[model samples]
Target: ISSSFSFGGFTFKRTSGSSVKKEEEVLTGNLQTLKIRVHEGYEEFTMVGRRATAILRKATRRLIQLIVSGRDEQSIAEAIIVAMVFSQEDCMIKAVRGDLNLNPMHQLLRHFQKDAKVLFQNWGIEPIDNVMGMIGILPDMTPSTEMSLRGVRVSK
Candidate 1:
Protein backbone atom coordinates (compact mmCIF):
# COMPACT_ATOMS: atom_id res chain seq x y z
CA ILE A 1 0.00 0.00 0.00
CA SER A 2 1.13 3.56 -0.75
CA SER A 3 0.20 6.32 1.65
CA SER A 4 1.17 9.89 2.55
CA PHE A 5 0.07 12.21 5.29
CA SER A 6 0.82 15.58 6.81
CA PHE A 7 0.46 16.80 10.38
CA GLY A 8 1.73 19.54 12.67
CA GLY A 9 3.73 20.94 9.73
CA PHE A 10 5.20 17.69 8.47
CA THR A 11 4.63 15.08 5.82
CA PHE A 12 4.88 11.28 6.04
CA LYS A 13 5.38 9.18 2.95
CA ARG A 14 5.06 5.45 2.44
CA THR A 15 5.81 3.70 -0.82
CA SER A 16 4.91 0.18 -1.79
CA GLY A 17 7.72 -2.37 -2.05
CA SER A 18 9.99 -0.19 0.04
CA SER A 19 10.69 -1.12 3.65
CA VAL A 20 11.75 2.38 4.63
CA LYS A 21 9.34 5.32 4.60
CA LYS A 22 10.09 9.03 4.92
CA GLU A 23 8.58 11.02 7.75
CA GLU A 24 8.53 14.80 7.93
CA GLU A 25 6.85 17.06 10.50
CA VAL A 26 7.30 20.78 11.03
CA LEU A 27 6.73 20.52 14.80
CA THR A 28 4.59 23.51 15.77
CA GLY A 29 1.84 24.93 17.98
CA ASN A 30 1.58 25.58 21.71
CA LEU A 31 4.42 25.10 24.21
CA GLN A 32 5.47 21.85 22.58
CA THR A 33 6.25 23.70 19.37
CA LEU A 34 9.91 24.19 20.22
CA LYS A 35 11.00 20.59 20.20
CA ILE A 36 13.12 18.21 18.11
CA ARG A 37 11.82 15.05 16.54
CA VAL A 38 13.30 12.09 14.73
CA HIS A 39 12.24 9.87 11.85
CA GLU A 40 13.13 6.26 11.53
CA GLY A 41 11.83 3.70 9.01
CA TYR A 42 8.28 5.11 9.10
CA GLU A 43 8.04 6.39 12.64
CA GLU A 44 8.65 9.76 14.18
CA PHE A 45 9.54 10.37 17.79
CA THR A 46 11.07 13.02 19.99
CA MET A 47 14.83 13.23 19.74
CA VAL A 48 15.07 14.85 23.16
CA GLY A 49 13.25 12.00 24.89
CA ARG A 50 10.49 12.08 27.52
CA ARG A 51 12.03 14.48 30.02
CA ALA A 52 12.27 17.39 27.64
CA THR A 53 8.94 16.57 26.08
CA ALA A 54 7.30 16.62 29.50
CA ILE A 55 8.84 19.99 30.23
CA LEU A 56 7.54 21.31 26.93
CA ARG A 57 4.08 20.04 27.82
CA LYS A 58 4.25 21.74 31.18
CA ALA A 59 5.28 25.03 29.62
CA THR A 60 2.38 24.77 27.20
CA ARG A 61 -0.07 24.12 29.99
CA ARG A 62 1.13 27.16 31.91
CA LEU A 63 1.01 29.28 28.77
CA ILE A 64 -2.61 28.36 28.25
CA GLN A 65 -3.34 29.62 31.74
CA LEU A 66 -1.46 32.81 31.05
CA ILE A 67 -3.45 33.57 27.88
CA VAL A 68 -6.82 32.97 29.42
CA SER A 69 -6.17 35.10 32.51
CA GLY A 70 -4.06 37.84 30.98
CA ARG A 71 -5.87 41.09 30.16
CA ASP A 72 -3.53 42.32 27.45
CA GLU A 73 -4.57 41.88 23.85
CA GLN A 74 -2.03 39.88 21.95
CA SER A 75 -0.63 40.49 18.49
CA ILE A 76 -0.35 37.62 16.03
CA ALA A 77 3.37 37.39 16.61
CA GLU A 78 2.96 37.81 20.37
CA ALA A 79 0.23 35.19 20.38
CA ILE A 80 2.48 32.71 18.69
CA ILE A 81 5.23 33.36 21.22
CA VAL A 82 2.75 33.14 24.08
CA ALA A 83 1.86 29.62 23.04
CA MET A 84 5.46 28.63 23.42
CA VAL A 85 6.19 30.74 26.48
CA PHE A 86 3.68 32.15 28.90
CA SER A 87 3.41 35.81 29.95
CA GLN A 88 0.77 37.51 32.10
CA GLU A 89 1.14 41.25 32.43
CA ASP A 90 -1.05 41.25 35.51
CA CYS A 91 1.26 38.80 37.19
CA MET A 92 4.12 41.03 36.15
CA ILE A 93 2.51 44.10 37.68
CA LYS A 94 1.79 42.18 40.85
CA ALA A 95 5.36 40.97 41.21
CA VAL A 96 6.80 44.41 40.57
CA ARG A 97 4.38 46.09 42.92
CA GLY A 98 5.06 43.70 45.75
CA ASP A 99 8.40 42.25 46.83
CA LEU A 100 6.91 39.62 49.10
CA ASN A 101 6.07 37.31 46.22
CA LEU A 102 7.73 36.55 42.93
CA ASN A 103 5.34 35.11 40.39
CA PRO A 104 6.30 32.42 37.89
CA MET A 105 4.98 34.49 35.02
CA HIS A 106 7.70 37.05 35.60
CA GLN A 107 10.36 34.37 35.21
CA LEU A 108 8.70 33.13 32.06
CA LEU A 109 8.54 36.66 30.70
CA ARG A 110 12.22 37.18 31.39
CA HIS A 111 13.07 33.96 29.65
CA PHE A 112 10.87 34.94 26.75
CA GLN A 113 12.55 38.33 26.48
CA LYS A 114 15.98 36.69 26.48
CA ASP A 115 14.94 34.17 23.87
CA ALA A 116 13.27 36.90 21.80
CA LYS A 117 16.40 39.00 21.98
CA VAL A 118 18.45 36.11 20.66
CA LEU A 119 15.93 35.49 17.90
CA PHE A 120 15.99 39.13 16.92
CA GLN A 121 19.75 39.09 16.91
CA ASN A 122 19.77 36.00 14.73
CA TRP A 123 17.58 37.78 12.19
CA GLY A 124 19.60 41.00 12.48
CA ILE A 125 16.47 42.88 13.47
CA GLU A 126 16.36 46.01 15.58
CA PRO A 127 14.41 45.72 18.82
CA ILE A 128 12.79 49.14 18.46
CA ASP A 129 12.08 50.25 14.91
CA ASN A 130 9.47 51.38 12.39
CA VAL A 131 7.78 48.00 12.31
CA MET A 132 6.23 48.55 15.75
CA GLY A 133 5.04 52.00 14.71
CA MET A 134 3.65 50.71 11.41
CA ILE A 135 1.94 47.93 13.32
CA GLY A 136 0.13 50.67 15.31
CA ILE A 137 1.95 50.09 18.57
CA LEU A 138 2.79 53.78 18.49
CA PRO A 139 -0.01 56.31 18.31
CA ASP A 140 -0.24 58.39 15.15
CA MET A 141 1.17 61.95 15.36
CA THR A 142 2.16 61.37 18.99
CA PRO A 143 5.22 63.34 20.04
CA SER A 144 8.06 61.28 21.52
CA THR A 145 8.16 63.37 24.70
CA GLU A 146 4.41 63.23 25.09
CA MET A 147 4.42 59.44 25.13
CA SER A 148 4.84 58.20 28.67
CA LEU A 149 5.18 54.68 29.99
CA ARG A 150 2.16 55.39 32.17
CA GLY A 151 0.27 56.23 28.98
CA VAL A 152 -1.47 59.51 28.01
CA ARG A 153 -2.90 61.08 31.15
CA VAL A 154 -5.83 63.42 30.61
CA SER A 155 -6.24 65.93 33.45
CA LYS A 156 -9.23 67.71 31.96
Candidate 2:
Protein backbone atom coordinates (compact mmCIF):
# COMPACT_ATOMS: atom_id res chain seq x y z
CA ILE A 1 0.00 0.00 0.00
CA SER A 2 1.14 3.56 -0.69
CA SER A 3 0.02 6.60 1.20
CA SER A 4 0.79 10.28 0.86
CA PHE A 5 0.37 13.21 3.21
CA SER A 6 1.05 16.93 3.20
CA PHE A 7 2.86 18.62 6.06
CA GLY A 8 4.41 22.09 6.28
CA GLY A 9 3.82 22.52 2.56
CA PHE A 10 5.76 19.34 1.72
CA THR A 11 4.28 16.11 0.36
CA PHE A 12 5.51 12.87 1.89
CA LYS A 13 4.74 9.45 0.42
CA ARG A 14 5.30 6.10 2.02
CA THR A 15 5.29 2.90 -0.04
CA SER A 16 4.70 -0.67 1.09
CA GLY A 17 8.27 -1.50 0.07
CA SER A 18 9.45 0.53 3.10
CA SER A 19 10.60 3.46 1.01
CA VAL A 20 9.69 7.02 1.84
CA LYS A 21 9.78 9.91 -0.61
CA LYS A 22 9.45 13.63 -0.09
CA GLU A 23 8.26 15.96 -2.83
CA GLU A 24 9.12 19.62 -2.65
CA GLU A 25 6.29 21.83 -3.77
CA VAL A 26 6.53 25.49 -4.66
CA LEU A 27 5.26 27.59 -1.83
CA THR A 28 2.66 30.23 -2.58
CA GLY A 29 4.17 33.70 -2.65
CA ASN A 30 1.88 34.84 0.06
CA LEU A 31 2.47 36.01 3.59
CA GLN A 32 1.43 33.56 6.31
CA THR A 33 0.47 34.22 9.89
CA LEU A 34 1.33 31.98 12.81
CA LYS A 35 -0.81 32.15 15.92
CA ILE A 36 1.20 30.49 18.65
CA ARG A 37 0.01 29.66 22.14
CA VAL A 38 2.40 28.34 24.74
CA HIS A 39 1.33 25.06 26.29
CA GLU A 40 0.80 25.27 30.08
CA GLY A 41 3.79 23.19 31.09
CA TYR A 42 6.17 24.77 28.56
CA GLU A 43 5.49 28.44 29.26
CA GLU A 44 8.63 28.89 31.36
CA PHE A 45 10.97 27.14 28.97
CA THR A 46 13.66 29.15 27.15
CA MET A 47 14.21 29.43 23.45
CA VAL A 48 16.94 27.11 22.14
CA GLY A 49 18.63 29.87 20.13
CA ARG A 50 18.90 32.17 23.15
CA ARG A 51 20.13 29.38 25.38
CA ALA A 52 22.71 28.27 22.84
CA THR A 53 24.88 31.31 23.40
CA ALA A 54 24.99 30.80 27.15
CA ILE A 55 25.71 27.10 26.96
CA LEU A 56 28.49 27.50 24.42
CA ARG A 57 30.15 30.28 26.42
CA LYS A 58 30.12 28.25 29.62
CA ALA A 59 31.40 25.11 27.92
CA THR A 60 34.16 26.96 26.13
CA ARG A 61 35.33 28.56 29.37
CA ARG A 62 35.39 25.18 31.11
CA LEU A 63 37.34 23.65 28.25
CA ILE A 64 39.88 26.47 28.38
CA GLN A 65 40.27 26.05 32.13
CA LEU A 66 40.76 22.33 31.70
CA ILE A 67 43.49 22.91 29.16
CA VAL A 68 45.15 25.58 31.27
CA SER A 69 45.09 23.36 34.38
CA GLY A 70 47.54 20.99 32.67
CA ARG A 71 45.74 17.90 33.88
CA ASP A 72 45.72 16.32 30.42
CA GLU A 73 48.14 16.68 27.51
CA GLN A 74 46.46 14.76 24.70
CA SER A 75 43.20 16.65 24.88
CA ILE A 76 45.02 19.91 25.42
CA ALA A 77 46.96 19.45 22.20
CA GLU A 78 43.82 18.44 20.39
CA ALA A 79 41.98 21.51 21.59
CA ILE A 80 44.88 23.70 20.60
CA ILE A 81 44.92 22.13 17.14
CA VAL A 82 41.23 22.82 16.73
CA ALA A 83 41.70 26.39 17.94
CA MET A 84 44.47 26.92 15.42
CA VAL A 85 42.21 25.76 12.62
CA PHE A 86 39.26 27.91 13.72
CA SER A 87 41.48 30.95 14.24
CA GLN A 88 42.09 30.96 10.50
CA GLU A 89 38.46 31.62 9.78
CA ASP A 90 37.06 35.17 9.41
CA CYS A 91 34.33 34.94 12.03
CA MET A 92 31.43 37.43 11.99
CA ILE A 93 29.34 36.77 15.06
CA LYS A 94 26.18 38.63 16.13
CA ALA A 95 25.48 38.64 19.86
CA VAL A 96 24.19 40.80 22.66
CA ARG A 97 26.42 43.22 24.49
CA GLY A 98 28.64 41.51 27.09
CA ASP A 99 27.49 38.20 25.64
CA LEU A 100 30.20 38.24 23.02
CA ASN A 101 33.64 38.22 24.58
CA LEU A 102 37.00 37.63 23.06
CA ASN A 103 37.10 34.17 21.51
CA PRO A 104 38.24 31.76 24.23
CA MET A 105 40.34 29.78 21.80
CA HIS A 106 41.90 32.97 20.58
CA GLN A 107 43.03 33.67 24.13
CA LEU A 108 44.75 30.30 24.24
CA LEU A 109 46.14 30.83 20.77
CA ARG A 110 47.80 34.09 21.81
CA HIS A 111 49.29 32.34 24.83
CA PHE A 112 50.40 29.43 22.65
CA GLN A 113 52.65 31.45 20.32
CA LYS A 114 53.23 34.71 18.47
CA ASP A 115 52.78 33.03 15.09
CA ALA A 116 49.18 32.00 15.89
CA LYS A 117 48.49 35.47 17.26
CA VAL A 118 49.64 37.02 14.01
CA LEU A 119 47.51 34.57 12.04
CA PHE A 120 44.50 35.39 14.19
CA GLN A 121 44.97 39.12 13.43
CA ASN A 122 45.35 38.40 9.72
CA TRP A 123 42.11 36.37 9.79
CA GLY A 124 40.18 39.43 11.12
CA ILE A 125 38.21 37.51 13.73
CA GLU A 126 35.77 39.47 15.88
CA PRO A 127 32.19 39.47 17.07
CA ILE A 128 29.59 41.72 15.45
CA ASP A 129 27.01 43.22 17.80
CA ASN A 130 24.05 42.84 15.45
CA VAL A 131 21.89 40.42 17.46
CA MET A 132 21.01 42.73 20.33
CA GLY A 133 17.52 43.31 18.94
CA MET A 134 16.93 39.72 17.90
CA ILE A 135 16.90 38.00 21.25
CA GLY A 136 13.72 36.19 22.34
CA ILE A 137 12.47 36.22 18.74
CA LEU A 138 13.04 32.51 18.18
CA PRO A 139 10.48 29.81 18.88
CA ASP A 140 10.31 28.51 22.40
CA MET A 141 12.06 25.27 23.22
CA THR A 142 10.06 22.21 24.24
CA PRO A 143 10.58 20.93 27.73
CA SER A 144 12.00 17.42 27.96
CA THR A 145 9.92 14.80 29.78
CA GLU A 146 12.82 12.57 30.82
CA MET A 147 13.56 12.40 34.50
CA SER A 148 17.08 12.25 35.87
CA LEU A 149 18.40 11.26 39.26
CA ARG A 150 20.49 14.42 39.50
CA GLY A 151 17.49 16.66 39.13
CA VAL A 152 18.77 18.38 36.01
CA ARG A 153 16.54 21.22 34.87
CA VAL A 154 16.21 23.36 31.79
CA SER A 155 16.93 27.07 32.00
CA LYS A 156 13.93 29.36 31.94
Candidate 3:
Protein backbone atom coordinates (compact mmCIF):
# COMPACT_ATOMS: atom_id res chain seq x y z
CA ILE A 1 0.00 0.00 0.00
CA SER A 2 1.15 3.57 -0.67
CA SER A 3 -0.01 7.16 -0.44
CA SER A 4 1.36 10.46 -1.68
CA PHE A 5 1.22 14.21 -1.03
CA SER A 6 1.81 16.86 -3.67
CA PHE A 7 3.30 20.28 -2.98
CA GLY A 8 5.64 22.87 -4.49
CA GLY A 9 5.59 20.95 -7.76
CA PHE A 10 6.46 17.66 -6.16
CA THR A 11 4.90 14.71 -4.45
CA PHE A 12 6.17 12.86 -1.37
CA LYS A 13 5.01 9.46 -0.27
CA ARG A 14 5.79 6.22 1.45
CA THR A 15 5.26 2.70 0.22
CA SER A 16 4.58 -0.51 2.00
CA GLY A 17 7.67 -1.61 3.98
CA SER A 18 9.14 1.88 3.90
CA SER A 19 9.18 2.67 7.60
CA VAL A 20 12.39 2.45 9.62
CA LYS A 21 10.96 0.04 12.16
CA LYS A 22 13.01 -2.82 13.41
CA GLU A 23 12.78 -5.98 11.35
CA GLU A 24 11.19 -7.93 14.15
CA GLU A 25 8.22 -5.60 14.00
CA VAL A 26 8.33 -4.46 10.40
CA LEU A 27 4.89 -3.87 9.00
CA THR A 28 3.78 -3.53 5.44
CA GLY A 29 2.21 -0.11 5.58
CA ASN A 30 2.58 3.43 4.35
CA LEU A 31 2.56 6.90 5.83
CA GLN A 32 -0.62 8.89 5.24
CA THR A 33 -0.21 10.90 2.03
CA LEU A 34 2.40 13.70 2.08
CA LYS A 35 2.40 13.40 5.79
CA ILE A 36 6.05 14.26 6.28
CA ARG A 37 7.56 11.91 8.85
CA VAL A 38 10.55 14.09 9.63
CA HIS A 39 10.27 13.82 13.38
CA GLU A 40 10.16 10.09 13.13
CA GLY A 41 13.01 10.05 10.68
CA TYR A 42 14.96 12.49 12.79
CA GLU A 43 14.52 10.16 15.71
CA GLU A 44 16.23 7.39 13.81
CA PHE A 45 19.35 9.22 12.71
CA THR A 46 22.26 7.10 13.97
CA MET A 47 24.57 10.07 13.66
CA VAL A 48 22.56 12.26 16.02
CA GLY A 49 21.98 9.84 18.92
CA ARG A 50 19.96 10.64 22.02
CA ARG A 51 21.39 14.08 22.73
CA ALA A 52 20.36 15.49 19.36
CA THR A 53 17.05 13.71 19.62
CA ALA A 54 16.30 15.52 22.86
CA ILE A 55 17.35 18.81 21.34
CA LEU A 56 15.08 18.20 18.37
CA ARG A 57 12.23 17.38 20.69
CA LYS A 58 12.68 20.50 22.76
CA ALA A 59 13.13 22.69 19.72
CA THR A 60 10.13 21.23 17.95
CA ARG A 61 8.06 21.84 21.04
CA ARG A 62 9.14 25.46 20.90
CA LEU A 63 8.15 25.69 17.26
CA ILE A 64 4.72 24.47 18.30
CA GLN A 65 4.59 27.25 20.80
CA LEU A 66 5.30 29.62 17.96
CA ILE A 67 2.21 28.32 16.21
CA VAL A 68 0.15 28.76 19.34
CA SER A 69 1.43 32.32 19.29
CA GLY A 70 0.24 32.71 15.64
CA ARG A 71 3.26 32.01 13.49
CA ASP A 72 2.56 30.72 9.98
CA GLU A 73 3.11 27.02 9.34
CA GLN A 74 5.54 27.63 6.49
CA SER A 75 7.69 29.94 8.54
CA ILE A 76 7.61 27.56 11.46
CA ALA A 77 8.53 24.71 9.18
CA GLU A 78 11.46 26.72 7.82
CA ALA A 79 12.77 27.41 11.27
CA ILE A 80 12.42 23.84 12.44
CA ILE A 81 14.10 22.48 9.37
CA VAL A 82 16.98 24.82 9.86
CA ALA A 83 17.23 23.76 13.46
CA MET A 84 17.33 20.11 12.52
CA VAL A 85 19.72 20.50 9.60
CA PHE A 86 21.95 23.20 10.96
CA SER A 87 22.39 24.28 14.55
CA GLN A 88 19.55 25.49 16.74
CA GLU A 89 21.20 28.90 17.12
CA ASP A 90 21.74 29.03 13.37
CA CYS A 91 18.10 28.28 12.79
CA MET A 92 16.94 30.99 15.16
CA ILE A 93 19.37 33.50 13.74
CA LYS A 94 18.23 32.84 10.19
CA ALA A 95 14.62 32.93 11.21
CA VAL A 96 15.20 36.33 12.78
CA ARG A 97 17.52 37.45 9.99
CA GLY A 98 19.77 40.47 9.47
CA ASP A 99 23.17 39.85 7.91
CA LEU A 100 25.70 37.08 8.28
CA ASN A 101 28.18 35.52 5.92
CA LEU A 102 26.20 32.52 4.81
CA ASN A 103 27.30 30.27 2.04
CA PRO A 104 24.81 28.86 -0.43
CA MET A 105 22.88 26.20 1.45
CA HIS A 106 22.30 24.13 -1.64
CA GLN A 107 25.98 23.21 -1.63
CA LEU A 108 25.79 22.15 1.98
CA LEU A 109 22.64 20.23 1.21
CA ARG A 110 24.32 18.47 -1.66
CA HIS A 111 27.08 17.35 0.67
CA PHE A 112 24.51 15.36 2.59
CA GLN A 113 22.51 14.26 -0.40
CA LYS A 114 23.72 10.68 -0.30
CA ASP A 115 22.93 10.27 3.35
CA ALA A 116 19.47 11.76 2.87
CA LYS A 117 18.75 9.58 -0.11
CA VAL A 118 19.73 6.46 1.76
CA LEU A 119 17.77 7.43 4.81
CA PHE A 120 14.69 8.33 2.79
CA GLN A 121 15.02 5.08 0.90
CA ASN A 122 15.27 3.11 4.13
CA TRP A 123 12.19 4.90 5.42
CA GLY A 124 10.46 4.29 2.12
CA ILE A 125 9.97 7.99 1.34
CA GLU A 126 10.38 9.58 -2.05
CA PRO A 127 11.53 13.17 -1.69
CA ILE A 128 9.87 15.25 -4.39
CA ASP A 129 11.79 18.43 -3.77
CA ASN A 130 15.31 18.72 -2.46
CA VAL A 131 15.96 17.94 1.20
CA MET A 132 14.95 21.51 2.14
CA GLY A 133 11.43 20.71 1.06
CA MET A 134 11.74 17.52 3.01
CA ILE A 135 12.85 19.32 6.18
CA GLY A 136 10.62 22.35 5.56
CA ILE A 137 7.62 20.31 6.53
CA LEU A 138 9.13 19.03 9.78
CA PRO A 139 7.22 21.41 12.07
CA ASP A 140 3.84 20.93 10.40
CA MET A 141 4.53 17.23 10.05
CA THR A 142 5.64 16.64 13.59
CA PRO A 143 3.51 15.59 16.57
CA SER A 144 2.78 19.31 16.91
CA THR A 145 1.70 20.33 13.50
CA GLU A 146 2.79 24.04 13.37
CA MET A 147 8.89 31.22 11.04
CA SER A 148 11.63 33.12 9.20
CA LEU A 149 10.50 35.53 11.81
CA ARG A 150 11.31 38.07 14.39
CA GLY A 151 8.94 40.15 16.47
CA VAL A 152 8.46 43.31 14.45
CA ARG A 153 10.86 45.93 15.70
CA VAL A 154 9.21 49.34 15.74
CA SER A 155 10.39 52.90 16.03
CA LYS A 156 9.78 54.34 19.43
Candidate 4:
Protein backbone atom coordinates (compact mmCIF):
# COMPACT_ATOMS: atom_id res chain seq x y z
CA ILE A 1 0.00 0.00 0.00
CA SER A 2 1.10 3.56 -0.67
CA SER A 3 0.01 6.60 1.27
CA SER A 4 0.88 10.28 1.42
CA PHE A 5 0.74 12.62 4.41
CA SER A 6 1.02 16.34 4.93
CA PHE A 7 1.78 17.99 8.24
CA GLY A 8 3.24 21.34 9.29
CA GLY A 9 4.17 22.34 5.76
CA PHE A 10 5.80 18.96 5.18
CA THR A 11 4.72 16.30 2.73
CA PHE A 12 5.47 12.62 3.19
CA LYS A 13 5.29 9.86 0.63
CA ARG A 14 5.21 6.32 1.93
CA THR A 15 5.92 3.12 -0.04
CA SER A 16 5.58 -0.51 1.10
CA GLY A 17 8.89 -0.58 3.01
CA SER A 18 10.21 2.97 3.01
CA SER A 19 9.08 6.56 3.04
CA VAL A 20 10.44 9.83 1.60
CA LYS A 21 9.35 13.33 2.38
CA LYS A 22 9.92 16.86 1.20
CA GLU A 23 9.54 19.90 3.46
CA GLU A 24 7.86 23.01 2.07
CA GLU A 25 9.87 26.16 2.46
CA VAL A 26 8.05 28.36 4.91
CA LEU A 27 7.87 32.04 3.97
CA THR A 28 9.60 34.34 6.39
CA GLY A 29 9.59 38.09 6.50
CA ASN A 30 10.12 40.98 8.85
CA LEU A 31 7.20 42.14 10.92
CA GLN A 32 6.04 45.49 9.59
CA THR A 33 3.40 46.29 12.19
CA LEU A 34 2.07 44.86 15.41
CA LYS A 35 -0.99 45.92 17.36
CA ILE A 36 -2.74 44.41 20.33
CA ARG A 37 -6.30 45.08 21.26
CA VAL A 38 -7.40 43.92 24.69
CA HIS A 39 -10.92 43.78 26.07
CA GLU A 40 -11.71 44.74 29.66
CA GLY A 41 -11.02 41.31 31.16
CA TYR A 42 -7.76 40.93 29.23
CA GLU A 43 -6.41 44.21 30.56
CA GLU A 44 -4.86 42.47 33.57
CA PHE A 45 -2.87 40.18 31.27
CA THR A 46 -1.30 43.16 29.51
CA MET A 47 1.15 45.68 30.97
CA VAL A 48 3.54 42.90 32.07
CA GLY A 49 6.32 44.36 29.92
CA ARG A 50 5.59 47.85 31.19
CA ARG A 51 5.58 46.66 34.81
CA ALA A 52 8.95 44.91 34.41
CA THR A 53 10.48 47.96 32.75
CA ALA A 54 9.19 50.17 35.57
CA ILE A 55 10.63 47.84 38.21
CA LEU A 56 14.03 47.71 36.51
CA ARG A 57 14.13 51.48 36.11
CA LYS A 58 13.25 51.93 39.78
CA ALA A 59 16.02 49.54 40.82
CA THR A 60 18.57 51.32 38.65
CA ARG A 61 17.58 54.63 40.22
CA ARG A 62 17.97 53.11 43.67
CA LEU A 63 21.48 51.91 42.85
CA ILE A 64 22.33 55.38 41.58
CA GLN A 65 21.14 56.80 44.88
CA LEU A 66 23.34 54.35 46.76
CA ILE A 67 26.35 55.30 44.65
CA VAL A 68 25.70 58.99 45.25
CA SER A 69 25.36 58.60 49.00
CA GLY A 70 28.20 56.12 49.39
CA ARG A 71 31.18 57.48 51.35
CA ASP A 72 33.49 54.46 51.30
CA GLU A 73 35.46 54.69 48.10
CA GLN A 74 36.56 51.05 48.25
CA SER A 75 32.98 49.84 48.54
CA ILE A 76 31.88 52.09 45.74
CA ALA A 77 34.77 50.87 43.62
CA GLU A 78 33.82 47.30 44.36
CA ALA A 79 30.30 48.04 43.19
CA ILE A 80 31.62 49.62 40.00
CA ILE A 81 33.98 46.71 39.41
CA VAL A 82 31.10 44.30 39.70
CA ALA A 83 29.03 46.43 37.39
CA MET A 84 31.82 46.54 34.84
CA VAL A 85 32.21 42.82 35.03
CA PHE A 86 28.52 42.42 34.38
CA SER A 87 28.56 44.86 31.49
CA GLN A 88 31.68 43.24 30.03
CA GLU A 89 32.41 46.36 28.02
CA ASP A 90 33.41 49.97 28.39
CA CYS A 91 30.75 52.00 30.14
CA MET A 92 30.14 55.62 31.05
CA ILE A 93 28.06 57.08 33.83
CA LYS A 94 26.82 60.51 34.83
CA ALA A 95 26.86 61.90 38.36
CA VAL A 96 24.67 64.22 40.32
CA ARG A 97 27.76 66.26 41.20
CA GLY A 98 31.22 66.53 39.73
CA ASP A 99 34.72 65.83 41.12
CA LEU A 100 34.18 62.31 42.40
CA ASN A 101 37.29 60.15 42.61
CA LEU A 102 36.81 56.62 41.20
CA ASN A 103 40.56 56.18 40.80
CA PRO A 104 40.72 53.54 43.50
CA MET A 105 38.41 51.31 41.49
CA HIS A 106 40.29 52.14 38.32
CA GLN A 107 43.50 51.00 39.97
CA LEU A 108 41.87 47.72 40.87
CA LEU A 109 40.52 47.41 37.33
CA ARG A 110 44.03 47.93 35.89
CA HIS A 111 44.52 44.18 35.56
CA PHE A 112 41.72 44.10 32.98
CA GLN A 113 42.75 47.44 31.48
CA LYS A 114 46.05 45.98 30.34
CA ASP A 115 44.22 43.94 27.69
CA ALA A 116 42.44 47.05 26.51
CA LYS A 117 45.85 48.73 26.19
CA VAL A 118 47.10 45.94 23.94
CA LEU A 119 43.96 46.21 21.84
CA PHE A 120 44.49 49.94 21.36
CA GLN A 121 47.33 52.18 22.60
CA ASN A 122 44.95 55.13 22.85
CA TRP A 123 42.86 53.24 25.38
CA GLY A 124 43.82 55.69 28.04
CA ILE A 125 43.18 55.08 31.71
CA GLU A 126 40.61 57.80 32.15
CA PRO A 127 39.43 58.65 35.65
CA ILE A 128 35.88 57.66 36.53
CA ASP A 129 34.17 60.52 38.33
CA ASN A 130 30.63 59.36 37.85
CA VAL A 131 28.78 56.01 37.65
CA MET A 132 25.20 56.99 37.00
CA GLY A 133 24.54 55.96 33.40
CA MET A 134 26.24 52.59 33.77
CA ILE A 135 23.77 51.50 36.40
CA GLY A 136 21.35 50.47 33.64
CA ILE A 137 24.00 48.18 32.21
CA LEU A 138 24.66 46.42 35.49
CA PRO A 139 23.04 43.03 35.76
CA ASP A 140 20.54 42.33 38.46
CA MET A 141 21.87 40.51 41.53
CA THR A 142 19.34 38.29 43.21
CA PRO A 143 19.72 37.94 46.98
CA SER A 144 20.37 34.41 48.12
CA THR A 145 20.81 32.85 51.60
CA GLU A 146 22.91 29.86 50.50
CA MET A 147 26.12 31.26 51.98
CA SER A 148 24.44 32.13 55.26
CA LEU A 149 22.89 28.68 55.48
CA ARG A 150 26.25 27.00 54.87
CA GLY A 151 27.95 29.20 57.44
CA VAL A 152 25.34 28.39 60.06
CA ARG A 153 25.66 24.65 59.47
CA VAL A 154 29.47 24.46 59.32
CA SER A 155 31.86 25.09 62.19
CA LYS A 156 34.77 26.37 60.15
The 10 consecutive residues of candidate 3 with the worst lDDT sum are 147-156
User: What do the candidate models score in CA lDDT, each in turn?
Assistant: 0.25, 0.22, 0.24, 0.22
By summed lDDT, which 10 consecutive residues of candidate 2 come out lowest? 38-47
Q: What is the lDDT of residue 20 in candidate 2?
A: 24
Question: Highest lDDT, which number?
Answer: 1
Better of 3 and 4 by TM-score: 3
Clashing pairs in 3: 18-123, 75-147, 76-147
Cα deviation of 57, candidate 3, in Å: 9.4
Number of clashes recorded per candidate: 2, 0, 3, 0
Query: How well is each residue in 1-156 modelled by candidate 4, as lDDT tens digits?
Result: 224533212232322232223222211112112111111110000001111211001111111111211223332333333333211122222110122223323422443333222212221232222233332111112112232110011111
Candidate structures ordered by lDDT, highest first: 1, 3, 2, 4
Residues 12-100, candidate 1, lDDT per residue (tens digit)?
Answer: 33322222323332222122222212222322111121111111111212221111111132222233233233212222222222122
Estimate, for each residue in 9-32, the C-alpha lDDT of model 2 and write its tens digit.
223232222222223221111222
Q: What ranges in model 3 sit over 4 Å off?
A: 1-70, 87-106, 109-156
Better-scoring candidate (lDDT), 1 or 4: 1
* Backbone clash pairs in model 4 (N, Cα, C under 3 Å; residues 3+ apart or in different chains), count: 0
Distance from true location, Cα of 151 in model 1, Å: 35
